[PDB]
Amino acid sequence: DVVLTQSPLSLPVTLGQPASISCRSSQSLVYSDGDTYLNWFQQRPGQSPRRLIYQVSNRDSGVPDRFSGSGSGTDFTLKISRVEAEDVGVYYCMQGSHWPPTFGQGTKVEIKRTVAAPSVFIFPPSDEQLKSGTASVVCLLNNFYPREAKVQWKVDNALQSGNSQESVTEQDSKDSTYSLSSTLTLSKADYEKHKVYACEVTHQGLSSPVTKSFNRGEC
């Protein structure tokens, strides 16, 4: 099949600066009608691809003027004149010239924005979960930038290891921030043997590490 190679695969861009994505094809995308069926798509997380450009350079209806396409033969370029927050996601070139239609691997556009300290929130386990014999304690770091953050769990001042998992959202399409969940999992027995549950957060935007904690039985 036709192979499309995108470069780069990760494209960090400052808000308001231009972005350029390369798509190279294993063979000329000129079809026997003399036209070139090279499209560009926009995919947001949990969303389907959305076509932005068709036949190399034609903007779809409703697509902002900041998106443009060029190239010929085997070499194509998508340009974003000024990256806006809503431009975060993965961009794919697609060829329909030589069936089957094939896609490049995707280029992930990441926005570089100003430093934003996380808000830090902690949630005790529910009584409903404790009746099932397990305690999940959740720490939320909300709307921060950059992505790099350290979360440490302390139980009665004991640093925990190997009993928590983290998840990080994709970059927000409005404010270009990340959010992070950290879930500490204990048995009901271990949970009810200790008093103080604490989430300690380190981030560039914080002037010193932030602790959010609760005492079991107060909450």
């Binding site: 069926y37 499209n39 389907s48 691809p49 959305r50 076509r51 068709y54 036949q55 779809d60 794919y92 697609m94 329909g96 069936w99 089957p100 239609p101 094939t102 896609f103 490049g104 691997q105 995707g106 808000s119 830090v120 929130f121 902690i122 949630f123 005790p124 386990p125 529910s126 409903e128 979960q129 099932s132 999940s136 959740v138 939320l140 909300n142 709307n143 998992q165 983290e166 998840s167 990080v168 959202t169 994709e170 959010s179 969940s181 879930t183 999992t185 959010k212 904690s213 609760f214 107060e218 909450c219």
Partner: protein
């Protein structure tokens, strides 16, 4: 306003079959060639099959030819994908796809546009069991209050396979919602949280309900999230 809605994604044991559906609306279905395309890390975006507007001709990708069947029922505005002899590498999100432009309604012009996509339906092929989630409140309190903001949520724990969806107050609350990517636990079951930020002052005046849907287990849970007085 062409719209496509896929159904049927589930966990399938290796070697077994699954039929997907796509309900078409907002366009004259019988005037369009219709496709299936899937997406996974292993495959990237991969075209699978097309059926012509008149249903006479079908074409298939090498990887699925002889295992997958595309068909259409115009009276039901429905496209089908019968997937037989499923393999681990068929694990993917499956999309229904068509085009706005049917100028040249024959091979190969219906591969040119590919600009109408459904929402996708997830197919998991593994030797494992389907399990519906437990849904627990992440109760707001002083400990989930920071300046002008409070957080609350739902923990959607111990389900398989992906995915789950979470709405808040049946879609009345969308601002400040973050539904986290699922993480695979040591048990081989997924867990995620869905959180929403609200004004700090709002705690104790408002009802919050997370609406959780795990289509693969046919599980639906509405969970009321009430503050902890602490």
């Amino acid at each position: 306003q062409a719209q496509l809605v896929e159904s049927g994604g589930a966990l399938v044991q290796p070697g077994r079959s699954l039929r997907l559906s796509c309900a078409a609306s907002g366009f004259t279905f019988r005037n369009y060639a219709m496709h299936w395309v899937r997406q996974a890390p292993a495959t990237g975006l991969q075209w699978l099959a097309v059926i012509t507007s008149d249903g006479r001709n079908k074409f298939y990708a090498d990887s699925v030819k002889g295992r997958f069947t595309i068909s259409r029922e115009d009276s039901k505005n429905t496209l089908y994908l019968q997937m037989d002899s499923l393999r681990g590498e068929d694990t993917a999100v499956y999309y229904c796809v068509t085009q706005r432009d049917n100028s040249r309604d024959y091979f190969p012009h219906y591969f040119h546009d590919m600009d109408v996509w459904g929402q996708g339906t997830t197919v998991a092929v593994s030797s494992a069991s389907t399990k519906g989630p437990s849904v627990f409140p992440l109760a707001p309190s002083s400990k989930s209050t920071s300046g002008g903001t409070a957080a609350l949520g739902c923990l959607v724990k111990d389900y398989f396979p992906e995915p789950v969806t979470v709405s808040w107050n049946s879609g009345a609350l969308t601002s400040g919602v973050h539904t986290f990517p699922a993480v695979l636990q040591s048990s081989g079951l997924y867990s995620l949280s869905s959180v929403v930020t609200v004004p700090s002052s709002s705690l104790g005046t408002q009802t919050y309900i997370c609406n959780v849907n795990h289509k693969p287990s046919n599980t639906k849970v509405d969970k009321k999230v009430e503050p902890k007085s602490c």
